Design an enzyme around this catalytic site. Structure first.
Site, PDB file in Angstrom:
ATOM      1  N   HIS A 148       0.821  -1.213   0.000  1.00  0.00           N
ATOM      2  CA  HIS A 148       0.000   0.000   0.000  1.00  0.00           C
ATOM      3  C   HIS A 148       0.860   1.270   0.000  1.00  0.00           C
ATOM      4  CE1 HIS A 148      -3.902   1.995   1.071  1.00  0.00           C
ATOM      5  NE2 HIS A 148      -3.080   2.905   1.570  1.00  0.00           N
ATOM      6  N   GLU A 149       1.750   1.371   0.984  1.00  0.00           N
ATOM      7  CA  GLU A 149       2.582   2.554   1.128  1.00  0.00           C
ATOM      8  C   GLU A 149       3.562   2.659  -0.031  1.00  0.00           C
ATOM      9  OE1 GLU A 149       1.517   4.704   2.762  1.00  0.00           O
ATOM     10  OE2 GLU A 149       0.371   3.767   4.358  1.00  0.00           O
ATOM     11  N   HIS A 189       1.666   4.553  -2.781  1.00  0.00           N
ATOM     12  CA  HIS A 189       1.641   6.024  -2.635  1.00  0.00           C
ATOM     13  C   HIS A 189       3.006   6.560  -2.971  1.00  0.00           C
ATOM     14  CE1 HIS A 189      -2.247   6.270  -0.843  1.00  0.00           C
ATOM     15  NE2 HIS A 189      -1.902   5.816   0.350  1.00  0.00           N
ATOM     16  N   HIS A 199       3.902   6.496  -6.693  1.00  0.00           N
ATOM     17  CA  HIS A 199       3.068   7.540  -7.304  1.00  0.00           C
ATOM     18  C   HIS A 199       3.791   8.875  -7.114  1.00  0.00           C
ATOM     19  CE1 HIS A 199      -0.237   9.619  -8.926  1.00  0.00           C
ATOM     20  NE2 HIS A 199      -1.219   9.197  -8.146  1.00  0.00           N
TER      21      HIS A 199
HETATM   22 ZN   LIG Z   1      -3.400   4.962   1.673  1.00  0.00          ZN
END
Ligand SMILES: [Zn+2]
Ligand SMILES: [Zn+2]
Ligand SMILES: [Zn+2]
Ligand SMILES: [Zn+2]
Ligand SMILES: [Zn+2]
Ligand SMILES: [Zn+2]
Length: 595
Positions: free
Chosen positions: A387-388, A391, A394
């Site tokens: 998940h991290e 981010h 991105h």
């Molecule tokens: Zn998140």
């Protein structure tokens, strides 16, 4: 065994020296500003002629430059603080830069409204000027507000109403979170388990149906008994939106909320329609859960029950897992992320005494991304890295390809990269798995997530839509009304599968008022986009991968739907949501034939 920050070996920690060598330099830099009387006189309104594109360019140039330095200092202080939250210097450093940001914000507060109040002619002159061409979208976002911004006295009043209009949400919290008393759940034995919001969530996932049932039912009774008051308070909030909407020249509250991001109401509206017409997907998935749990019927409190029932991963192993699991994102993505997690110092890996809890990604234009973890070794942990890492990549890609003022992607797009990574990881782990109990575990976690973040949110979205509508037409939102509206809705979504309990339709009362103003739909659009991008990538459809990668490098350079269009997702059409549904259908079928 628990250790203090200072005994933690630096190979386990992120490397924040690329920002500042050490606090002395950080402090040195913080100093350049000379805190004051105005601290930036260069930014006084009087110093600028806004009918002159060269002056405006000067303004933007100078404020972006300061802002950039402030953010660098912020990030450095905040990251330092999170290493050990009780450290006194940690805390003081942060409070300084924070104070500086508030000063900046006060000193520059004149800018936005001076711009939104230029003539149409000047607006167009600026949107046409070539020395302003790199700042077109930035200014476009600001000038679009002119047609919904009145005289400065008119606006002075709206800004003024904000204060008194907080009351609805505040009262809601004191009742919901503090003062209304909680009741008691019961297990099969007969042990009572007293309740709280956090316990209620835990019991939703319990293995003991009786606990799930008495917990859910007690939660309904809690709210049902203050149903008139919650209706009043919600009516109040919604009427607040109506007040602001109709005085800023919007035709409805939805348009008021969708304008910032330039979203056509039809996108919101068709999302609801298409999703309702796929209610059958809920029906399919839940019956699998029902047959597999051997239950004669299926209640809302059955929705999160587990179907099956634990490995442990070293950090190293987590990385090896990510690395192979995300391979469809390409060698280059996979290596950059691996380098960040292992040699580039992106990651603060482990718990230490007083380290901030949970997880996140941060950084600014000038840094690499920084991931704060509390790595404990579970499969949940691994996915938090995924998940991290999402981010983070991105942000990394956007900073590398955009100028400072265009680099931050808006909130509407901030959940896509992370969600896609979560989903990819599960997808790859299924493919790689041999154990059937695992496969069910994975498939179950994945559909629960999809069904709660897509369908359940879209339910909230139509609800929020119907009640604002009703209000707009002066209909008053009584508990009787709210509860019917929500009941029909539960029905459109869950009617073919769920057996209702007598208070099931009180749910609208437990949903916090900050879930209001039409942002919840963005959870759904985010997951739809992530699933769409992902499905194309797993099937090698045209160059879907290049497209996703181009999306990641786009930052906030255009309106979010436009950024997505450029990347092959046209939310103005039905394609992305159909690609999402495809992915879900496939997974329901895999699961269905594991039983
Ligand atoms: Zn998140
Ligand atoms: Zn228990
Ligand atoms: Zn029943
Ligand atoms: Zn490039
Ligand atoms: Zn109407
Ligand atoms: Zn009543």
């Amino acid at each position: 065994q628990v250790r203090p920050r200072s005994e933690i070996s630096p190979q386990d920690c992120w490397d924040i020296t690329p920002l500042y060598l050490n606090r002395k330099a950080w402090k040195a830099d913080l100093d350049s500003f000379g805190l004051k009387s105005p601290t930036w006189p260069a930014l006084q309104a009087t110093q600028y002629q806004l009918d002159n594109s060269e002056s405006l360019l000067s303004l933007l140039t100078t404020l972006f430059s300061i802002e950039r330095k402030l953010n660098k200092l912020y990030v450095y202080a905040h990251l330092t603080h999170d290493q050990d939250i009780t450290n006194q210097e940690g805390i003081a450093d942060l409070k300084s830069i924070t104070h500086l940001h508030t000063l900046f914000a006060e000193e520059t507060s004149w800018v936005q409204p001076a711009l939104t109040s230029l003539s149409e002619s000047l607006i167009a002159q600026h949107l046409s000027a070539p020395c302003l061409a790199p700042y077109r979208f930035y200014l476009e976002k600001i000038f679009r507000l002119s047609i919904h911004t009145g005289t400065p006295g008119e606006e002075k009043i709206l800004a003024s109403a904000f204060t008194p209009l907080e009351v609805a949400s505040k009262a809601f919290s004191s009742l919901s979170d503090s003062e209304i008393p909680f009741g008691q759940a019961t297990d099969s034995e007969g042990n009572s388990h007293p309740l709280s919001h956090a316990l209620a969530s835990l019991y939703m996932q319990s293995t003991d149906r009786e606990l799930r049932k008495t917990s859910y039912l007690a939660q309904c009774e809690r709210y049902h008994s203050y149903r008139h008051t919650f209706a009043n308070l919600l009516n109040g909030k919604i009427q607040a939106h109506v007040f602001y909407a109709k005085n800023k020249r919007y035709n409805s509250c939805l348009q008021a909320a969708l304008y910032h991001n330039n979203i056509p109401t039809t996108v919101y509206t068709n999302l609801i329609d298409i999703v309702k017409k796929n209610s059958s997907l809920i029906t399919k998935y839940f019956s699998i859960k029902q047959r597999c749990l051997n239950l004669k019927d299926f209640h809302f409190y059955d929705v999160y029950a587990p179907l099956s029932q634990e490995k442990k991963y070293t950090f190293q192993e987590a990385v090896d897992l990510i690395y192979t699991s995300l391979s469809p994102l390409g060698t280059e993505y996979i290596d950059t992320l691996k380098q960040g997690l292992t040699t580039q110092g992106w990651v603060d890996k482990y718990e230490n005494l007083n380290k901030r809890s949970g997880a996140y990604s941060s950084g600014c234009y000038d840094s690499h991304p920084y991931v704060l973890l509390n790595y404990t070794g579970t499969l949940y942990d691994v996915s938090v890295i995924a998940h991290e890492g999402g981010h983070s990549m991105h942000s990394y890609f956007s900073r590398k390809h955009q100028p400072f003022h265009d680099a931050q992607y808006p909130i509407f797009l901030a959940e896509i990269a992370s969600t896609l990574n979560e989903m990819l990881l599960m997808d790859s782990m299924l493919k790689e798995s041999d154990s059937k109990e695992e496969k069910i575990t994975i498939l179950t976690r994945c559909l629960d997530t999809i069904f709660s973040t897509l369908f359940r949110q879209v339910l909230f979205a139509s609800f929020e839509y119907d009640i604002h509508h009703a209000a707009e037409h002066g209909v008053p939102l009584t508990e009787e009304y709210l509860s019917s509206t929500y009941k029909n809705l539960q029905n459109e979504f869950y009617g073919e599968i769920i057996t209702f309990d007598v208070l099931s339709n009180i749910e609208w009362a437990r949903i916090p008022h900050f879930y209001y103003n039409f942002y919840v739909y963005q959870y759904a659009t985010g997951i739809i986009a992530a699933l769409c991008f992902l499905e194309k990538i797993l099937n090698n459809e045209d160059n879907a991968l290049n497209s996703y990668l181009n999306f990641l490098k786009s930052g906030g350079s255009d309106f979010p739907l436009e950024i997505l269009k450029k990347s092959g997702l046209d939310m103005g059409t039905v394609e992305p949501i159909q690609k999402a549904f495809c992915f879900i259908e496939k997974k329901i079928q895999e699961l269905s034939s594991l039983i």
